[PDB]
Amino acid sequence: GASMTIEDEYSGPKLEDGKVTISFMKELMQWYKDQKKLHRKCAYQILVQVKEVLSKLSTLVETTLKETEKITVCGDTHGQFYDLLNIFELNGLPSETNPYIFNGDFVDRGSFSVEVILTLFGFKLLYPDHFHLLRGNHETDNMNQIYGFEGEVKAKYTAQMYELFSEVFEWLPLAQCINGKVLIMHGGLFSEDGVTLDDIRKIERNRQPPDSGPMCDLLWSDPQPQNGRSISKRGVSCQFGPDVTKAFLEENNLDYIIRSHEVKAEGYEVAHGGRCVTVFSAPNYCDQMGNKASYIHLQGSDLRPQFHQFTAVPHPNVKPMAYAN
Numbered sequence: 001g002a003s004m005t006i007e008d009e010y011s012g013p014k015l016e017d018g019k020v021t022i023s024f025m026k027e028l029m030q031w032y033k034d035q036k037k038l039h040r041k042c043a044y045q046i047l048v049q050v051k052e053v054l055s056k057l058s059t060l061v062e063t064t065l066k067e068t069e070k071i072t073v074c075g076d077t078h079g080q081f082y083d084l085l086n087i088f089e090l091n092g093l094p095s096e097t098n099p100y101i102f103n104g105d106f107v108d109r110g111s112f113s114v115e116v117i118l119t120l121f122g123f124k125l126l127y128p129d130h131f132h133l134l135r136g137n138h139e140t141d142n143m144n145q146i147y148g149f150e151g152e153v154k155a156k157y158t159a160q161m162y163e164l165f166s167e168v169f170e171w172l173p174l175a176q177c178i179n180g181k182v183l184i185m186h187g188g189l190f191s192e193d194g195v196t197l198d199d200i201r202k203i204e205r206n207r208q209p210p211d212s213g214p215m216c217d218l219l220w221s222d223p224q225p226q227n228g229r230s231i232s233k234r235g236v237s238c239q240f241g242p243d244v245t246k247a248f249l250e251e252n253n254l255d256y257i258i259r260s261h262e263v264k265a266e267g268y269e270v271a272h273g274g275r276c277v278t279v280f281s282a283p284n285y286c287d288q289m290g291n292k293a294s295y296i297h298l299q300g301s302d303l304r305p306q307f308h309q310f311t312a313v314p315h316p317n318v319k320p321m322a323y324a325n
């Protein structure tokens with residue numbers, strides 16, 4: 001009898017004619033909360049589509065916020081899916097009236113990286129002009145190989161799915177500028193003076209980052225409190241001082257930068273006299289750091305950063321870096 005066969009009844013949320021909808025996203029978040037897996041065909045469809053969307057973007061996303069329009073900027077999330085859901089509960093779901101920017105490092109370290117990245121990609125498809133993803137140093141092959149994401153994708157899906165993730169990450173833009181005044185990138189500024197927005201737009205980004213150069217710096221550099229630059233403590237890119245930030249901002253007619261890429265106990269830091277802000281959105285990082293996290297609110301008519309701090313929420317018993325080397 002027809003009632004006795006089973007096909008895809010029990011395999012979870014499905015796209016609507018291959019497309020992301022709000023209902024799908026709500027179903028997906030619940031499915032993931034309950035530690036279940038998105039059907040591989042749906043994951044594939046999300047990846048192919050988001051690759052297409054991202055590949056049409058400039059390396060520098062340039063966004064205009066009208067006077068009364070707001071946006072939220074989040075820093076690193078590192079596969080802390082339950083904390084990601086908490087951000088949406090604290091700050092509202094993404095929408096055309098509640099836009100978000102996630103400033104890189106979505107994956108690795110935390111062991112729900114697949115759930116974070118597919119949720120973020122789903123929202124990018126749903127609200128392509130109001131949900132922004134910028135590349136971090138962890139959206140790269142070398143980092144994924146060591147720090148969990150490659151292992152996690154291979155465990156949950158296959159090596160072929162991982163290859164596709166790698167290709168998609170290559171199209172993530174490297175920076176975003178709001179109203180010609182606030183520049184957002186994962187890492188920071190440059191190992192030499194005189195770089196302008198033109199240079200960022202010119203980066204052919206669909207690749208793994210070079211060992212040095214502007215693409216490397218955007219993903220890897222850190223501020224230092226003293227003037228000038230130093231070779232990075234990380235062995236990649238540089239540390240840049242307040243004079244570097246100020247010269248860059250002045251030449252480019254910008255007010256300040258928002259970057260991520262470093263943990264802060266309070267979830268954020270205001271440095272370089274207000275010119276360099278760090279936002280970090282992974283509370284109690286790797287279940288050990290004990291840090292608060294934050295996200296930033298901004299408005300078209302007032303682009304000053306307003307910080308909202310939050311703390312970690314419970315998650316299932318999977319250890320951080322369970323999938324790592």
Ligand SMILES: C[C@H]1C[C@@H]2O[C@H]1[C@@H](C(=O)O)[C@H]2C(=O)O
Nearest residue numbers: 076105137138260261262263
């Ligand atoms: C220790 C954490 C601070 C930042 O996130 C983690 C680390 C990491 O991503 O490996 C840093 C980075 O973004 O490079």
Ligand SMILES: [Mn+2]
Nearest residue numbers: 076105261262
């Ligand atoms: Mn990070």
Ligand SMILES: [Mn+2]
Nearest residue numbers: 105136137261
């Ligand atoms: Mn980083």
